[PDB]
């Protein structure tokens, strides 16, 4: 059975009405796409703020009545975004800068893109779609829509039925909803003005939804793309070719020696993405716990509305590095330029990037001239990235562009220039600005652009095979410890790591490396480490014994291990931001094109173009090519998806009489029903892989991986102890003037150590020899290029260096993945001019005065030494990928794929990337403790006693049991009964009489009840024949 079969009958969508007197307008604005002067905006679908608790995201939509006595059902999930269209001026903007709507309109025309064309009717008047008696001036109005019928919403083909109203609680607010049905549920017809239409809603969808999907296919005719997606949903056209006539090609493709085959492969890849991406998006999805806004942990310490709004702004700053990476990276998914041809045979066709290519003129599928190109334009100068390229990245949408500018306001400036206040009072205030007229100089988009200028990418016209950058939610099962997926199943490497954390818990160390007791001095600092080393070395033995007795070939299984990350294919798993809708949809469309390239090439090699145009060639071949794609794209190493049949159990269902409801009368009927579609394609994950071990086989590469063995002078300060020797410096050397770095570098060259005024000399001579000894042992043995920050990472490094040595892996460093994690900080506002608002600024002295008392929130990324603990917190991720394709082994002739982790392009992305083969990076933000929520003492006494008695050998245990009881219970031991003693001793309950006789001697000898006094009394107060 499946989630589709289990979903209930219902409408095609809803109109929600929220009361303006009580609804939390400033909270929704922080999650919205509002610009100054808007008439519509987008917000996320969330239980407890935009829909009621218990909203069903999966439904069977009643969409057609073939006659008045039969219904047809379509299984579909909801669309991720909600569109706010009535009284939308009541929701605050996310960004204060003026003039965005005209800037978007001008820039859409120079790139040759299609603007929204309105229907010849007026928009529906409030009295047509409002419930009876509600005042239109008192409410905010918004649409929630199913993924299969959203083009029908755009085209004005839905009907609202106000008599079928339902009253619903949305957080605190008493709200109302009205259902939407497709006009095909009325076979006798309804009048054309009785259908629901809003021109501001349709224009918002054109810009914020469909234009970015057109950019992902390299199509300019957005309105024709919407028409062909509607007919594909309503008339089952998935196996019919449809996008090829809308395609356009650059001069590098038209001048190519293989141009005829390239035009067919580029066209067929786009056709397949349009066939399969909508089907996977419409499928039934799991409901994440992050969809419930009132259980979000981030609000837990908040009191009142101001604290809740300030908590949402901190939440948004933690997501900003994902959004700014997709703007600053030269190889961003937003800058994909098309397909080109060389690489090995299956890699020979590949995806290209470049904004210079995107400016050029084009030719149609019949080699005739099409778009004529744009020559380019500001403060970044000639041939460089300009504000128009940011408008192109935002799909010419003022709603998307406003939310991009809001995320860019968290970014630091990096000068490669006028002072900020002399720019804001100077050139930003000029009447020549086409955005603010100089009347809003501190928040203007041109001021933000001037500040971030040296971080934007270069403008490229080349055709090289590079990785592209993707963003989204991670899946459930990531393998990102030092040896990745090594022994993941059959003890398992997962179980080995759980055993080590249990040993570290007995030493007083938690899963994040925090101590229950900090080291007191030199002896305690040495003792702390020697116990961890002994605990790791004990677990290596028990593991190597398991591999030996089972004859497992672990020595060859190390050679083939990979790091693995899962990219989720659920649209509801993404973070609650409308920009992540576009980043997810464009990542999916790009991955489906890149997977399809060799499938199209092999079919065309067998069925050549012979001078046909792609629309002519596809007319015969496309139905067969769909079936090859379904067989060869899925379960072949990147994409996983499950096919299923959807069934409805009852022959009829309880539904309102829609003919009576159109006339205002409400009552039920048991309408006969059947499914209009049976097959569903449920998407699961996209899988990303990185190879762990370099084997020395590729002789060109060795110099990047090779392990040196000679005795360096940096061996202590670049060794395993330096971070701890710094963290504990004030406890090791009380009141010393020396830096920790100089103290240990002086020791590393002069062999001497300072002894505090009352402390003992030989205690410090031992500390020095511990540091020296372990640092030289690490210099010899280590193949993991990390300086560990905490005892858990120190322990895990020691463990994995032992396994690699047993495998004979000693000549090379292993590959590393490092996580870049956002840290949010408050700074003085002097260089962050947007805190001043739409305020007029008259002089640099007034700018300096007004900023002198103010602070700005900013974000930077910090490198973690331990990606696997971040992956346990279910992170939002951003990473580079190339999809490589290769033949099977053992004489097989099929094609298999891997999505391999690559590199970021462009020097503005992050300062930690500024200069490798052997280190790669991922950006990660955790969701546990932000949007998703994370014994009796007599059981613990009992466990600790069974742990003593099961280990004590060659001595009688009663004194060590009595000391543990006197420690845990003190004076309460004086009356310990036999029934209590027998329970606490557990398996060893036979010992009870000897324990109670011993406790009576402590009670009667008049010493106090403490473990120190118990030993002092007991330790102050044989014949043995051998047997055959």
Here the tokens at position 799 are 């463990």
Instruction: State the DSSP code for 474.
Output: B
Burial group, residue 888, by CB count within 10 angstroms (0-12, 13-18, 19+)? exposed
The minimum distance between CB 810 and DNA, in angstroms, equals 15
557 binds DNA (CB under 7 A): no
- When the beta carbons of 35 and 694 are compared against DNA, the nearer one is 694
Taking CB under 7 A as the rule, does residue 522 contact DNA? no
Judged by CB under 8 A, the stretch of 191-199, 305-313, 778-786, 982-990 that binds its own copies is 982-990
Residue 916 within binding range of its own copies, rule CB under 8 A: no
Q: Give the other-Cβ count within 10 Å of 83's Cβ.
A: 25
Whether residue 948 contacts residue 988, with contact meaning beta carbons closer than 8 Å, is answered with no
Binding map of its own copies across residues 653-692, x = CB under 8 A, - = no contact: --------------------------x-----xxxxxx-x
| Binder of residue 631, out of its own copies, DNA, Zn ion, none (CB less than 5 to 8 A by kind) | its own copies
905 binding DNA? (CB under 7 A):
yes
| Distance separating alpha carbons of residues 577 and 213, to the nearest angstrom | 18
Q: Which stretch binds its own copies (CB under 8 A): 159-167, 169-177, 664-672, 746-754?
A: 746-754
CA–CA distance, 690 with 875 (Å, rounded to integer): 18
User: Does residue 441 sit in helix, strand or coil?
Assistant: coil
Among its own copies, Zn ion, DNA, none, residue 436 binds (CB under 5-8 Å by kind)? Zn ion
d(CA 796, CA 805): 14
Using the rule CB under 7 A, is 299 a contact of DNA? no
Main-chain phi, psi angles of 17, to 5 degrees: -115, 120
Binding mask 992-1021 for its own copies (x = CB under 8 A): -xx---------------------------
- Smallest CA-to-CA distance from 409 within 495, 316, 293, 545 is with 316
Kindly identify the residues of this chain, within the stretch 793-832, that bind its own copies according to CB under 8 A. 823, 825, 827-828
Binding Zn ion (rule: CB under 5 A), the pick from 46, 217, 436, 583 is: 436
DSSP character string of 929-985: TTTB----HHHHHHHHHHHHHTT--SS--HHHHHHHHHHHHGGGGGG--HHHHHHHH
Q: Count interface residues toward Zn ion (CB under 5 A).
A: 5
Residue located via tokens 């959807």: 646
* Tokens encoding 545: 């014994």
In the set 444, 591, 653, 686, which binds Zn ion (CB under 5 A)? 444
Q: How far apart, in Å, are the Cα atoms of 220 and each of 101, 199, 358, 614, 686?
A: 19, 21, 11, 18, 29
* Integer CA distances (angstroms), 645 to 623, 676, 931, in order: 21, 12, 33
Closest contact distance (angstroms) between CB of 93 and Zn ion is: 16
Q: Of these partners, Zn ion, DNA, its own copies, none, which one is at the site of residue 850 (CB under 5 to 8 Å by kind)?
A: none
818, 858, 831: which is closest to 320 by C-alpha?
858
Q: By CB under 8 A, what part of segment 168-207 binds its own copies?
A: none
Identity of the residue, 349 or 423, whose beta carbon is nearer to Zn ion in the bound complex: 423
CA dist., res. 448 & res. 397, Å (int)? 18
Neighbours of 781 (CB within 10 A): 15
Residue 433 contact partner, candidates its own copies, Zn ion, DNA, none, CB within 5 to 8 A by sort of partner:
Zn ion
- Name residues contacting DNA, limited to 809-838 (CB under 7 A): 815
Kindly report the number of other CB atoms within 10 A of residue 189's CB atom. Answer: 8
Tell me whether residue 909 or residue 976 sits nearer to DNA (CB atom).
909
Least Cβ distance, residue 448 to its own copies (angstroms): 19
The yes or no reply on residue 912 touching its own copies (CB under 8 A) is: yes
Q: Which is nearer to DNA, 147 or 539 (CB)?
A: 539
Instruction: Find all residues with CB under 8 Å of 895, minimum gap 6, and list them.
Output: 346, 598, 599, 602, 632, 636, 885, 886, 887, 888
Residue 903 binds: one of its own copies, DNA, Zn ion, none (C-beta under 5 to 8 A by kind): DNA
For tokens 């994995």, name the residue: 800
Please, are residues 78 and 145 in contact by the beta-carbon 8 Å criterion? yes
Binding residue for DNA, selected from 255, 553, 892, 935, defined by CB under 7 A:
892
Residue whose C-alpha is closest to residue 800's, from 543, 527, 419, 519: 543
The Cα 987–Cα 995 span in angstroms is 15
Region from 643-651, 798-806, 835-843, 912-920 binding DNA, contact rule CB under 7 A: 912-920
374 scored as a contact of DNA (CB under 7 A): no
Collapse the DSSP code of 369 into the 3-class scheme (helix H, G, I; strand E, B; otherwise coil) and give the result: strand
Among 433, 861, 866, 905, binds Zn ion (CB under 5 A): 433
Which does residue 939 touch among its own copies, Zn ion, DNA, none (CB within 5 to 8 A, set by kind)? its own copies
The binder of DNA chosen from 900, 994, 1001, 1010 (CB under 7 A): 900
What's the DSSP call for residue 63?
E
CB 738 to its own copies: min, Å: 6
Q: Which CB, 646 or 883, lies closer to DNA?
A: 883
Phi, psi (5° rounding) for residue 632? -110, -15
Kindly state the smallest distance separating residue 680's Cβ from its own copies, in Å: 13
- Which tokens hold the place of 293? 């806004």
742: partner contacted, choices DNA, its own copies, Zn ion, none (Cβ within 5-8 A by kind): its own copies
**Is residue 652 at the binding interface for its own copies, with CB under 8 A as the rule?**
no
Binding test (CB under 5 A) with Zn ion, winner from 88, 208, 264, 435? 435
- Bridge partner residues of 67 (DSSP): 70
Residue choice 22, 739, 810, 887 for contact with its own copies (CB under 8 A): 739
Task: Give the footprint of DNA on residues 378-407 (CB under 7 A).
Answer: none
Which own/partner contact pairs does 334-337 have at CB distance under 8 Å and 24+ positions apart? 334/215, 334/393, 334/586, 335/393, 335/457, 336/216, 336/468, 336/590, 337/218, 337/250
The interface with Zn ion within residues 445-464 (CB under 5 A) comprises 446
* Candidate list 692, 795, 803, 941; residue touching DNA; CB under 7 A: 692
In whole angstroms, give the CA distance from residue 327 to residue 579: 12
CB of 702 to DNA, least distance (A): 10
Determine, following the binding rule CB under 7 A, whether residue 650 of this chain makes contact with DNA: no
Subset of 862-891 contacting DNA (CB under 7 A): 882, 884, 886, 888-891
444: partner contacted, choices DNA, Zn ion, its own copies, none (Cβ within 5-8 A by kind): Zn ion
Asked whether position 429 contacts Zn ion by CB under 5 A, the answer is: no
Q: What residues numbered 491-510 form the site for DNA, per CB under 7 A?
A: 492-495
**Tokens linked to 697:** 């086989």
Q: State how beta strands 70-77 and 58-67 pair.
A: antiparallel
Per CB under 8 A, 279 contacts its own copies: no
**Site for DNA contains 701 (CB under 7 A):** yes
Partner from DNA, Zn ion, its own copies, none contacting 882, C-beta within 5 to 8 A by type: DNA
Residue 886 contacts which entry, Zn ion, DNA, its own copies, none (Cβ below 5-8 A, type-dependent)? DNA
The Cα–Cα gap between 343 and 885 comes to: 11
Kindly write out the interface string for residues 930-969 of this chain, putting x where it contacts its own copies by CB under 8 A and - elsewhere.
-----xxxxx---------x-----xxxx-----------
Per CB under 7 A, does 975 bind DNA?
no
- Hey, what's the torsion of the CAs at 442, 444, 447, 452, to 10 degrees? 120
Q: How many CB atoms lie within 10 A of CB 415?
A: 7
Which of the stretches 262-270, 375-383, 590-598, 988-996 binds its own copies when contact is defined by CB under 8 A? 988-996
Question: Which positions touch Zn ion (CB under 5 A)?
Answer: 433, 435-436, 444, 446
Question: Which positions touch DNA (CB under 7 A)?
Answer: 477, 479, 488-489, 492-495, 635-637, 640, 684, 687, 689-695, 698, 701, 815, 882, 884, 886, 888-892, 896, 898, 900, 902-905, 915-918
């Amino acid at each position: 059975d499946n989630l589709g079969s289990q979903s209930q009958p219902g409408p095609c969508g809803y109109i929600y009405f929220y009361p303006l007197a009580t609804y939390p307008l400033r909270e929704v604005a922080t999650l919205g796409t509002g610009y100054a002067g808007h008439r519509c905006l987008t917000v996320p679908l969330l239980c407890g703020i935009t829909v009621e608790p218990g909203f069903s995201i999966n439904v069977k939509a009643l969409h057609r009545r073939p006659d008045p006595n039969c219904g047809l059902l379509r299984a579909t999930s909801y669309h991720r975004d909600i569109y706010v269209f009535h009284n939308a001026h009541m929701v605050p903007p996310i960004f204060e800068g003026p003039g965005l709507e005209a800037l978007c309109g001008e820039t859409r025309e120079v790139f040759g893109y299609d603007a929204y064309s309105a229907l010849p009717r007026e928009s529906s008047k409030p009295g047509d779609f409002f419930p009876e008696g509600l005042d239109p001036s008192a409410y905010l109005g918004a649409v929630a829509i199913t993924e299969a019928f959203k083009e029908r919403l755009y085209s004005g083909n839905l009907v609202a039925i106000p008599s079928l109203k339902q009253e619903v609680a949305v957080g605190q607010s008493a709200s109302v909803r009205v259902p939407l049905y497709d006009k095909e549920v009325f076979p006798e017809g309804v009048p054309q003005l009785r259908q629901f239409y809003n021109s501001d809603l349709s224009r918002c969808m054109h810009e914020a939804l469909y234009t970015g999907l057109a950019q992902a296919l390299r199509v300019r005719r957005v309105g024709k793309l919407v028409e062909l997606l509607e007919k594909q949903s309503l008339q089952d056209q998935a196996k019919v070719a449809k996008v090829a006539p809308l395609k356009e090609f650059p001069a590098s493709t038209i001048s190519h020696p293989d141009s005829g085959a390239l035009m067919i492969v580029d066209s067929a890849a786009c056709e397949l993405a349009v066939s399969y991406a909508p089907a996977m998006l419409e499928a039934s999805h799991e409901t994440p716990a992050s969809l419930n806004y009132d259980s979000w942990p981030l609000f837990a310490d908040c009191e009142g509305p101001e604290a809740r709004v300030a908590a949402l702004h901190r939440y948004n700053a933690s997501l900003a590095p994902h959004v700014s990476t997709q703007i600053f990276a030269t190889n961003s998914v937003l800058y994909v330029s098309g397909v080109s041809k060389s690489e090995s045979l299956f890699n020979s066709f590949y995806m290209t990037h470049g904004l210079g290519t995107l400016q050029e003129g084009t030719w149609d599928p019949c080699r005739r001239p099409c778009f004529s190109g744009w020559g380019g334009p500001g403060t970044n100068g000639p041939g460089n990235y300009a504000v128009e390229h940011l408008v192109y990245a935002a799909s010419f949408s003022p709603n998307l562009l406003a939310r991009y500018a809001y995320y860019l306001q968290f970014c630091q400036g990096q000068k490669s220039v006028p002072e900020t206040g002399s720019y804001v009072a100077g050139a930003a205030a000029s009447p020549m600005c086409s955005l603010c007229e100089g009347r809003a100089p501190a928040v203007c988009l041109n001021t933000l652009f001037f500040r971030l200028r040296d971080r934007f990418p270069p403008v490229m016209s080349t055709q090289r095979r590079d990785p592209y950058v993707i963003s989204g939610a991670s899946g459930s099962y990531n393998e990102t410890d030092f040896l990745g997926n090594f022994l993941n199943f059959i003890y398992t490497y997962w179980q080995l790591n759980q055993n080590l954390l249990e040993r570290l818990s007995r030493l007083g160390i938690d899963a994040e490396g925090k101590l229950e007791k900090e080291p007191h001095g030199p002896r305690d600092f040495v003792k702390m480490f020697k116990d961890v080393d002994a605990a790791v070395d004990a677990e290596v033995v028990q593991f190597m014994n398991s591999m030996a007795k089972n004859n497992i070939t672990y020595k060859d299984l190390v050679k083939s291990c990979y790091h693995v990350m899962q990219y989720s294919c659920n649209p509801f798993a993404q973070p609650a931001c409308p920009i992540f809708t576009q980043l997810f949809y464009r990542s999916l469309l790009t991955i489906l094109q890149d997977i399809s390239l060799p499938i199209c090439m092999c079919y065309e090699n067998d069925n050549p173009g012979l001078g046909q145009s792609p629309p002519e060639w596809l007319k015969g071949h496309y139905q067969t090519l769909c079936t090859n794609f379904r067989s060869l794209a899925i379960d072949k190493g990147v994409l996983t998806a499950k096919e299923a049949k959807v069934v409805h159990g009852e022959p009829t269902c309880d539904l309102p009489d829609l003919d009576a409801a159109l006339q205002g009368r409400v009552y039920g009927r048991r309408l006969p029903v059947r499914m209009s579609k049976v097959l569903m394609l449920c998407p699961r994950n996209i899988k990303i892989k990185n190879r762990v071990v370099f084997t020395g086989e590729n002789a060109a590469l060795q110099n990047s991986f090779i392990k040196s063995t000679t005795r360096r002078e940096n061996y202590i300060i670049n060794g395993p102890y330096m971070k701890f020797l710094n963290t504990y410096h004030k406890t090791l050397f009380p009141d010393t003037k020396l830096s920790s770095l100089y103290l240990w570098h002086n020791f590393s060259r002069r062999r001497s150590v300072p002894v505090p005024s009352g402390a003992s000399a030989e205690e410090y001579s031992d500390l020095a020899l511990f540091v020296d000894g372990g640092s030289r042992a690490h210099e010899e043995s280590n193949v993991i290029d990390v300086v560990p920050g905490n005892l858990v990472t120190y322990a895990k490094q020691r463990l994995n260096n032992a396994i690699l040595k047993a495998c004979g892996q000693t000549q090379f460093y292993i590959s590393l993945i490092q996580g870049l994690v956002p840290r949010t900080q408050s700074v003085p506002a002097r260089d962050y001019p947007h805190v001043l608002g739409t305020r007029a600024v008259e002089s640099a002295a007034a700018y300096a005065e007004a900023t002198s008392s103010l602070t700005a929130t900013t974000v930077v990324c910090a490198a973690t030494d331990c990606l696997s603990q971040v992956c346990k917190a279910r992170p939002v991720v951003t990473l580079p990928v190339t999809i490589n394709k290769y033949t099977g082994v053992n004489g097989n002739n099929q094609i298999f794929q891997a999505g391999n982790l690559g590199y970021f392009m462009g020097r503005g992305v992050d300062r930690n990337l500024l200069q490798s083969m052997r280190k790669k990076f991922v950006f990660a933000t955790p969701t546990l403790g932000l949007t998703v929520k994370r014994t009796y003492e007599i059981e613990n006494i009992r466990a600790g006693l069974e742990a003593i008695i099961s280990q004590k050998q060659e001595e009688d245990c009663v004194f060590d049991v009595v000391c543990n009881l006197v420690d845990a219970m003190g004076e309460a031991c004086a009356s310990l009964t036999r029934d209590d003693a027998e329970y606490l001793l557990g398996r060893f309950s036979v010992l009870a009489d000897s324990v109670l006789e011993t406790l009576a001697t402590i009670a009667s000898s008049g010493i106090e009840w403490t473990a120190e006094a118990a030993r002092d009394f007991l330790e102050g107060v044989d014949n043995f024949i051998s047997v055959a």
